[PDB]
Symmetry: D2
Subunit: 289 residues, 4 copies
DNA sequence: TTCGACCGGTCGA
DNA sequence: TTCGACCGGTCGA
DNA sequence: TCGACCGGTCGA
DNA sequence: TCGACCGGTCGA
């Protein structure tokens, strides 16, 4: 029956036949009866070998690492997205949302804000571009956003996802649409960058991400002159985090160490090593409370 | 013939036979007649095809795309270090040095500084760790460092490298050792991140680099209360830079936009698309002046 | 003697003599607005009083009873002199207002509802600390506003004689603008002093510092780098290099970073010898 | 015996016969045997009468309150400089000095610093002048300086002053000379502005004082990147301090409230109402610890 | 078709 | 070994 | 000439 | 009562 799987799709491109992995089909096809749990890494290899056996059975050629790197990325994100969906359900956080975000083009995360907040950000933008050396504040959407605003929770969000289905995955991955233009600037409490693995270079992308996000938030705090609002950014790896990874992720928010009296603040507040799905819950516990 | 090449080396690891690319040997072997010129890519391709032909001849396994990623980066950097070495020579700057840097563990770039400057850095970095929330300022060594300090130029540096040889390469790649602990903080004028290609995520590593580097420099300027001193960071790609790449690289140094009065500054001052070796000269012209 | 420049009030069965500098202005200028030497015109108002008592059977008002009065007079002169300036200058979108004390009318009141709010945000925030902090300074003697919709045709009628109303209309100009000034419509403030002392001069650096500090926060709330406020000083006497140096003290908040470009609390100090100089000063201030 | 006292003086101011209150001698005569104690407020009035009785007696006119205001202030600063000196004696702070400072011209307080610290200040004050809009950091010397540096205490400072005599007063008023060029920047812990009375305008001179002093200290902290060092400025009045006086003296250091996260600070940390010599000790107790 | 964001497989020290 | 820094091959929108 | 002090107001 | 003004010193 593997020859019937859809985790891989064939197509021609410029007369060239190519095979494409469909990460969601592999998910749906393996977890439609119960949602994954246990060791996250095993689930990633399980999903990967599955795709490899399906392709082997279809008589197609094993996808390149590039394909698997991409795919594994998605798998990791969705598993975390679903686990987060259920997390707030069983933890009964009726004023919190943990959203898996799309890329910045599909939906620039700045869109989640109410119009007053969107105006302040525009103020700053147009301003930074109004110079000899035009300046911007760009960063990829954070993988996960954690919002705390009661009036945004719809009763349907309280229905746990107990199996991976086109429908269930879609509701999780489109949850972001519901909050568009409705969040008060300080309703945003934290962001999380997800990475199946780290590298001396890639891990720095987390620091950049937390830095630009916290720089934006810092400007909203001044706009609304509110020193108590706080935004934290976190990183999560499915593998062990070395000391080197740790130190790197302790990098200060350059805008927070300008002054000798200024208090240091890390771009990435904390890095989590998620070995099991239970750990996702523990991480969220530490992030949210 | 090719079966005699050394661009590829075989070895066993845990009873498993593996083939390793030796990027330098491919360089030396393809350019001991004359140093590369023209289209940077056609050259990088030429260097890769050569690694594959030697592999088919040797009967060995065709190296993974991950092995050609690592390697290709090594080639780009090297092909540049050489062009820059002869650049300063053919343009005549007995006060400028363009150094290809090793990784931060082999030689933390902070070591290029004299004892007084390195102490100011210690003060800061020791201060940042002296908090409940420990903070650091970590970034990979910039690929290229441009120093301007007359007393550091040795007459040997004026001997152009006209062919790639174990020595021609080593002298270029060990040039950094000579200046250890001898640079005055403001002798450092610019850094350059080199990348054969960009990606929406990787390109942000340049912004992080420039940001942390400029943050450190900003603190030295404070330390020596010298508003004149500058440090600029640049990015160089061997491929076309899209409008998206551009905008992303216009990201400001968060620590320069804290105040409504603070003049915005870019983490990466400019991004260069280097199609030919002549462009490397043009880039350097704009950077140095 | 029939004059009202002076008075004689009861204070614990110890009859004392007060001066109503106002009358000593109208009663000495119902004719016309003084001009020429600010120095000499000041004494004219003083001898007019040194007499009202020398022929009314009274005693000499203390050096200080006059210091107070000598100040006022000085002020009203510049104050009234600025009215005939805007008019005889064509500054229809400008107002030069002689401010009352911060109690009578806290200058923060000149701002529209949105601006006054931002200020509340801040000054309320500053009080929300274990160590409560404030941003207090006496109202600047003179305020220069630039907002077209605040000019009323009556402001264009020059004052060519000092009368209870000419005074009263000037010393109340601030009322018309209350709660009507956009934040960036404030262009400058000026400190007036007949003389300067090494200690008293530091009050202008403070005045300007607290004013600029405030305005600075208005610039950040509206993220508008362009807007700017300036503070100036004015002595009816010479200014020594020590007064100049002291008055060069930049804003401690404008020199925090070795990159931030410095600014002075008091942008410039003017020595006004004649009424002709008041116009010159205003010319430089208004740009 | 009054008609020969030295508390006054008749100098020739272009013809006119003028009386120059000679303040120091008026203390030395009322206190030729013991230190003034009990009530400051009162002790001031008597000092005023004695000198106000050596006048009419000698057939002269009671010098103008102007000369008295000038005179009165000094008596206050002097009495304080004395109780302050004996104060560290009875308490025995063998590493503390409470110095009555001369005007900034006679001895610019910046002179108390060692070479290195004076250097840093020069950097700054030279930099500020290097602009289109020349800027300075000027303030009158603080009335009282409190230094904490063990190696500056000479055994001779431990001999309490029990009576006001020319030699005594002068040892107290020249104590500042001893420490010239010897203090480490952070050895300076607090300054105190003394005023027999306050006024809505004059009290703001205290705020300016503290502000400029704290601004300078702030730059030294930067210079030596030491966030631990702290300088406090206080005000002391011989009369009751109204709520208006209080609020005014609550004005913050414009340079500590530039950022929303910036933690606000007062130019004048606290204002003391000194009714008795008893209170001078109490004030110092607070200040010093 | 282009752009966004993902990461795994190195070679060298 | 592990740690530093490199980047090319995706799948989705 | 300059530094730093403050007490005696007039008005609200 | 509180706001803001400044002129008359004594010393260096």
């Amino acid at each position: 029956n593997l020859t019937n799987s859809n985790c891989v799709e064939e197509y021609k491109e410029n007369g060239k036949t190519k095979i494409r992995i469909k990460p969601f089909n592999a998910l749906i096809e393996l977890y439609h009866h119960q949602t994954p749990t246990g060791s996250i890494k095993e689930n990633l290899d399980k999903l990967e070998n599955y795709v490899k056996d399906v392709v082997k059975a279809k008589g197609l050629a094993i996808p390149t690492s590039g394909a698997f790197s991409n795919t594994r990325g998605t798998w990791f994100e969705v598993m975390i997205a679903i686990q987060s969906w259920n997390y707030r359900v069983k933890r009964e956080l009726n004023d919190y949302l943990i959203i898996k975000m799309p890329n910045v083009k599909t939906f620039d995360f700045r869109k989640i804000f109410d119009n007053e907040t969107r105006e302040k950000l525009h103020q700053l933008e147009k301003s930074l571009l109004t110079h000899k050396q035009q300046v911007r504040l760009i960063t990829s959407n954070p993988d996960l956003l954690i919002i705390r605003q009661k009036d945004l929770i719809k009763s349907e969000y309280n229905l746990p996802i107990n199996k991976l289905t086109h429908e269930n995955i879609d509701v999780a991955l489109t949850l972001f649409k519901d909050i568009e233009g409705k969040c008060k600037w300080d309703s945003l409490v934290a962001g999380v960058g997800l990475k199946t693995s780290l590298r001396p270079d890639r891990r720095l992308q987390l620091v950049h991400e937390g830095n630009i996000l916290k720089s934006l938030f810092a400007h909203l705090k001044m706009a609304y002159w509110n020193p108590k609002a706080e935004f934290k950014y976190y990183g999560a790896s499915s593998e062990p985090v070395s000391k080197a990874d740790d130190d790197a992720l302790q990098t200060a928010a350059t805008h927070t160490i300008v002054n000798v009296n200024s208090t240091p603040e890390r771009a990435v507040d904390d890095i989590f090593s998620l070995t099991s799905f239970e750990d996702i819950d523990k991480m969220l516990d530490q992030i949210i409370k």
